[PDB]
Write a protein that binds this ligand. Structure first.
Ligand SMILES: [Mg+2]
Length: 180
């Protein structure tokens, strides 16, 4: 069985974009951060720890627009119990049509790989936005790299990628732009 159901009517003409959470859209820590965007309590072996979450600058604009341009899918190497609460707070617009977590990755040579082949979408119309090439070793021709983000409040990578996405949203075959 594929990782996604069939695309709903309003999504099936669109390109599918698989989006990484950590160091791509947000950055989370167990070290207390003053003036955090969100704090989520995560239970680990019966004990609750606070996870301090910072949003990358421009992520609201980015997410809002990507959910129009694309069938967006959150595909994180992290675990639902941290990633669901975070996505609930982040995704104000219903941008993420599905959420896929650690179990849905393939652990390959010490790396959590998003294997786009198990999605159930024609690979000519799938993109992956990820801060590490390890994320997409199987699909390097589907990828749009973005630098890892931690706390640099002057970052504008998400803002500056939007026009490129704006363009990719409209092609028929992403390989015609990325090359395969
Ligand atoms: Mg990441």
């Amino acid at each position: 069985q594929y990782l996604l159901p069939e695309a709903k009517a309003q999504d099936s003409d669109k390109i599918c974009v698989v989006i990484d959470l950590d160091e791509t859209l947000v950055h989370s820590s167990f070290k207390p951060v003053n003036n955090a965007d969100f704090i989520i309590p995560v239970e680990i072996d019966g004990v609750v720890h606070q996870v301090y979450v910072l949003k990358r600058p421009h992520v609201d604009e980015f997410l809002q627009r990507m959910g129009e341009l694309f069938e967006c899918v959150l595909f994180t190497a992290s675990l639902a119990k941290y990633a669901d609460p975070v996505a609930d707070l982040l995704d104000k617009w219903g941008a993420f049509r599905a959420r896929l977590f650690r179990e849905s990755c393939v652990f390959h040579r010490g790396n959590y790989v998003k294997d786009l082949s198990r999605l159930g979408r024609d690979l000519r119309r799938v993109l992956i936005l990820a801060n590490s090439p390890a994320s997409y070793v199987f699909h390097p021709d589907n990828a749009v790299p973005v630098a890892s983000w931690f706390d640099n409040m002057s970052d504008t990578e998400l803002h500056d990628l939007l026009p490129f996405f704006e363009q990719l949203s409209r092609v028929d075959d992403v390989y015609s732009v990325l090359r395969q």
